Design a protein around this ligand. Sequence first.
Ligand SMILES: [Zn+2]
Ligand SMILES: [Zn+2]
Lengths: 397, 397, 397, 397, 200
Amino acid sequence: MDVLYSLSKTLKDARDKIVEGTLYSNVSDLIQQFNQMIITMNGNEFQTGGIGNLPIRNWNFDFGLLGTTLLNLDANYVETARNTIDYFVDFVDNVCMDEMVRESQRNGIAPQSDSLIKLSGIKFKRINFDNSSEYIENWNLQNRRQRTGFTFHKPNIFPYSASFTLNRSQPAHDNLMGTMWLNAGSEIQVAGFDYSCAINAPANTQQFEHIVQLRRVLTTATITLLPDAERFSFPRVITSADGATTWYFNPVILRPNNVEIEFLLNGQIINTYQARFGTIIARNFDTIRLSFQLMRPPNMTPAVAALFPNAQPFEHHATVGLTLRIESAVCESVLADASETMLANVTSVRQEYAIPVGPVFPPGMNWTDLITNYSPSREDNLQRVFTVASIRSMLVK
Amino acid sequence: MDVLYSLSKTLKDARDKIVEGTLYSNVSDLIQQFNQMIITMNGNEFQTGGIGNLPIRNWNFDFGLLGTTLLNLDANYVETARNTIDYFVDFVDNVCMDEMVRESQRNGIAPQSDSLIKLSGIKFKRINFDNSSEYIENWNLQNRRQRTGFTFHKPNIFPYSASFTLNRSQPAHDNLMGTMWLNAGSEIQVAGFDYSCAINAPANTQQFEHIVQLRRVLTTATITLLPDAERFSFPRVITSADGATTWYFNPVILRPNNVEIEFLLNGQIINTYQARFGTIIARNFDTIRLSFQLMRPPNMTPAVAALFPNAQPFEHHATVGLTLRIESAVCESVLADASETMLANVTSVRQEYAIPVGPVFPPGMNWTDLITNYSPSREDNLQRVFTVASIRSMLVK
Amino acid sequence: MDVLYSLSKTLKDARDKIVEGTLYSNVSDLIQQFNQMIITMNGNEFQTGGIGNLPIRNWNFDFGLLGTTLLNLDANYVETARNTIDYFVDFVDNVCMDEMVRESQRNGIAPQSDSLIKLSGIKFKRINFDNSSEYIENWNLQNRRQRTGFTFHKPNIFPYSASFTLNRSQPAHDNLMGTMWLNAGSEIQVAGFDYSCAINAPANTQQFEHIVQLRRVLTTATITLLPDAERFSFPRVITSADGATTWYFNPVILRPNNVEIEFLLNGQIINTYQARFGTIIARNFDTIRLSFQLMRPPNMTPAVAALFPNAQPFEHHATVGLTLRIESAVCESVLADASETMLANVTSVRQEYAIPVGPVFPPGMNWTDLITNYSPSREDNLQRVFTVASIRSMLVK
Amino acid sequence: MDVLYSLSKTLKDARDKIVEGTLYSNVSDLIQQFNQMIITMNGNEFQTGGIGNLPIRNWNFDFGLLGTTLLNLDANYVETARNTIDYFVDFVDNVCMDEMVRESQRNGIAPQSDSLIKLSGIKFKRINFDNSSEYIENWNLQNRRQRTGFTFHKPNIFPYSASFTLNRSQPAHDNLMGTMWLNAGSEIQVAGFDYSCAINAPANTQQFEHIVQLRRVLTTATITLLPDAERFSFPRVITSADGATTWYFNPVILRPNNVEIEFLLNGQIINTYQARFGTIIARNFDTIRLSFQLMRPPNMTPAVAALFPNAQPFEHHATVGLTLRIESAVCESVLADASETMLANVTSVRQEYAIPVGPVFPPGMNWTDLITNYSPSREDNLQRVFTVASIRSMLVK
Amino acid sequence: LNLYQKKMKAIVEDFLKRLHIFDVARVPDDQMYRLRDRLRLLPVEVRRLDIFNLILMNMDQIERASDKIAQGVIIAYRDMQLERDEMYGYVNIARNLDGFQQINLEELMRTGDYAQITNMLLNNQPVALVGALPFVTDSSVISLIAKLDATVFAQIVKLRKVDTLKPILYKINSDSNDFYLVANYDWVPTSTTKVYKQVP
Ligand SMILES: [Zn+2]
Ligand SMILES: [Zn+2]
């Protein structure tokens, strides 16, 4: 595997540092590495493809070295080189793709394809070099069993979930109390509603709570917390819990009272914030708990008083809410986020070549399904597959 | 051109690796490259500026080189060097800016300025070196007529468009049916409304559809699709299509029924998703088609039934919607996005120096106007201009 | 690729300049080139076919050189040569065909087949020669990214489109006003009709306009423009816009008034002609706009007056029209035209070998579909495929 | 002049036969010719442009000859060559264009531009070679005085002419007899009409005739002759001869009787065809005479009899016609046709550079005006200008 | 160092000899060359390498720094104004080519002549010659008047060669030149030619 990596940084730092002009001395250290490769390869034979709509292609090697002679570089030098690179590019592409499709339950971590299995061979190890590409960097550290870690912008930790829970309801759905939410990606919006505006509630306050359990721990998270859930601030006609009928939600929004956000790790409070809106840091957590209340306004102007009668019908439904967004965070496990193309690359190659559903990944590499049941096997396969996608993107985008 | 590039990575890898103390043998390979330059330059005269409020500064070359001795670097060594760098910096800045304003209908892809035209000369090619900066990387691969590609978080593919289409309307605007939307940047929000709540519609279902045609194909897109269009979930007073009067929109939101998103390429469905909210992948498309329906609730509690009478006046307007956001994608053409400063750099330099409107770009480099009529000439000029902005940002931010 | 080219001009200039008689001296320069080939080939092994109904064939090389001895040429010399040529002919045919079927989205420009991919190899480049064949000529100039260009007689730029637009209509379709047209290939015919003969129109003149947007710019076009649209000068029964009924068109033709043809490029008028019929030149345009009017005759003999009453029924329908034909033009992109057999060759080879529909080209290489959505990928594939067809036609027709 | 020619075939056979990989000996004979040029040139300086919007650029020569690195060229060899070619290309373009705009009444058959006048100088003749380009081929043969000759597809010999001649008419235009036609390009359509259907005509037959005089003799013409003039087979409202009113034409078509086509040369019948439709050959003619008759049907079914009463009003107008198209022909004088781009090239260069109207050519190089008054001066200038356009198209399209 | 000559054996021979162990000669030819083939593909002991990089950077400077030999000459067949420099006094030096073709003597000589130069000289055209070259100083005020500098050239033609191409300079100082009936008459130096030796 690491082998694979090199193959690319070789080509990149190649198709990059080798051009009509420059001095030999700037590539001397490079040129070498290169040749070294050609050698190890030549003589060997390969095979890629064979699954689904993926073409089968065989490759052989028999190439000349490089003029370690010249001082500067003349146009002619390049072209005779670029011609050799292009065969490797078109190669690697086919190599990546071929191993970017196969999955495996037992050992979903190690190589699969006839192409790569052959590379992990010892006789090729004579090629590793410059592993500064964030992903491979972490691939190694994990082999040696040590503390890994990646960086994500608007990570995708929450499987899509949009629902409600009626804590007080009745057939007519004319005096409900409960919460409704949307957990998706890196965002959570939750609203607590009480049709009665806490008219008969102790201290005229109704307590609400929303708990979200992450499938993986996030560390060093920068989070935006804002009062109100705009998504649940407008009139709605919703299906009843049993699907037998529809209820009416006509919200009027009040400020959430006694807001408390807790970021817990294994049941322990790691970070807690009381009514702090804006930017907050959650340094290590696997669970978020949002507690907030609706407090009936003790003093009301006529217009307000008119919305909240002492007796039904309750026509304006008191609602309080919160919005929480994880802007960035670090995770020890690979995840999809709003910036990296890994998930999209893997999903795209599989879709383009009509790769059949396998035993590990959900149909279509569906993110929600994947993160909902993020088993060790899915994670090992995902990491292998994401690391390969990242190796491929160094040359082919 | 590529020439230009070097000039910088030269200086950066210079103003960076040349510090009081470091061991020489870390820059041996570097030092060289440097000198090589000075030589090729010395004996040449340049001129930049001359347009709008851009000064016309003149430059000459005549410099000594650098010692090669010394195990380690002594402070004195640096300062005598930094003094030489600063003249090149202040130079390049003026060089970039001068070629970052001129546009040419004809060959808007070729060099313009007297300054650069002179660089593409052969006698200067002896300076090229280390082309790994994502942009130049793609500049080459294109000049050779090959497959390019870039990376964008929240790309800016949709020209601003905020409007509506009334499929059923009448003078009083008291029983409308149609859609309203906002396409902007990487996001689309669209709502379908039916004042009658499909009371007389076949199967009590009203079909809606929203089609958006991209000006460039996006590949490997990671997309968030969510039900509801919050932007169109509140009461509005809107101007009529003819601008003669104003209508009232008083939405009540229902879940979009039979949601189907199609990502098409040249009329062909490449990806299709049925009612799948959350994160989805669209691997290659030039068009997005969102189809969704409003289905009159077959069972209604009294509160709901009251909103939807059998006869007018229709006072609560049934609305269903969708929100789609392209988090990341790859495009073969340069585009503005939410992270890169290229567009802002080009636009800013032109604004600061009062550069007159030219024949290629819309006034103020207006993004909406640019992407709406993204001609080949505008794209070639944009790419040239974006690549220069990226070369400049390696040294001057 | 260029490699391929040679292979042929080699054979042509061979099966042509080598015959029972002539002097050595006329081929000396040639003979050489030839041998040079045999060498480079011998030892190598190939494979063509394997897709659809295309036979798989393997080829090996082990041939003797040529007697560079003799003065004149004796019959015997030829026959021993022709025998060697025939193996190459039957070869190339199979090579062309094999690469004339495969398509590819990502890189639809470069080679596909195992046969050709091997040719682009460096070790064969030792064969290029005499690239005066118009197509290869342009293939190169495009690699070096420069101004290309082809020549066409009755080009095929307009996708088939035959329709109408009723600007004034009513259920009975007894007093219509609008236009009907046929855009196909290199021709446009458009008619403007007004059942009322502009009886209530300002200045008794009805304005018409027909705009046609080319998918590619045409330069140096020689065009025939004639008044009248014969195709729309006869009685017709046509389907209504909604397909629910049929209307009657009973034209009577008048000369088009204030004819103005504009050939625009990116919205700018490049050429404009006012009422000029016959041969006109449009030097560079991507759009054609034809504007013409129907002017009610101010003076009418009884027979004419009788056709145009002050009140309905309107039984004779005043019609004015134009016919425009692009006889020849130059395009920077390959196109089908009325003389070249490229499209037909590619389409024919695919049909004969039952080649399955691929990811790039429309089913059956349908021209209208192709030109309607002439994407960059379709054009690159079309050019590759057209260039190969042209290489093949040098030997096999 | 001939000089000029070479300059190109030099470059073409150059930018063509000189590629990465061809054996030296395939260009030995060529290389030479090339160098020979450089020599003769270097030293002398030139001026192009200096008219309308045409730029005045100054060209100077200072080039090193061509090496000969043995055994097939190395990439490097090419690039150092291509760099030299590109200066000549960009040169010639400017040379052609500069002499492609100047006209002269007195001697408008010789070189005008300061650029070319200098080339006809003796010290340059040393370059001329391979005069196989059809146009130059004929340029020479004319300088010596001999049988020239060009080849055209759908030649453009007929100036646009669309009119009628009423042989019998009256104010009401209710009983007309005459002909109407369209002569344009290579086609003629003519119809003979008799509102009375020869009711009072001798032998119930009305004779018609249409004569067209070519401005130049056409030889070896392949012609399509078909009965009927579709263009004049539909109802029309036409302006009267004096423009004071409009008449009604309501044709009903009968087969033309006793059709006789004569192709005359200086008043002598060279070819004559009696009622022969399809493909006919006219080997040498300057005039075409079409004679045809309308013969009242001696036997008529009721439906037919009803169209042709013994007394006015005559409501169905008996019409007979012919269509003649010159598919191909040879002319001793240059002409525009449906395949060659010469006229379009000359017209386009003049339009692009805003070249002022001169003393020889009609405004806009209008074809109809040109061929209508095709004076010796216009022809000599046209030939010079067409020959230059053809030299230019060998390199720049 | 573009020494497209020795490279093969030359170095190899010395190499082996110093190794002592074996007596070259009986080293099959496929051996000695193959030995190079392998040698040429290795780094270079920083020491070694580090120095060459240094020599090359100053190479140019040395060459023009010498007292004998300058780089090429120019011919313009245009009465030209002699320049003046504190050190040489009144001389015809040019510190820069630019405006006249360049002809790599080395290239010409090594590859035979096609007279490209022969024609340019004959129809008398502005041209330059580049590389290292012989040299001649002269004090004969008169000389200049006699236009000697436009002579030497014709030579070449004869047979290829171009070794015998000593060009001329006029170290005309207001002194050591018995020939000074010059500043006594209103006048200005008309040198038809000058040279590249940059100033020390
Ligand atoms: Zn963002
Ligand atoms: Zn035709």
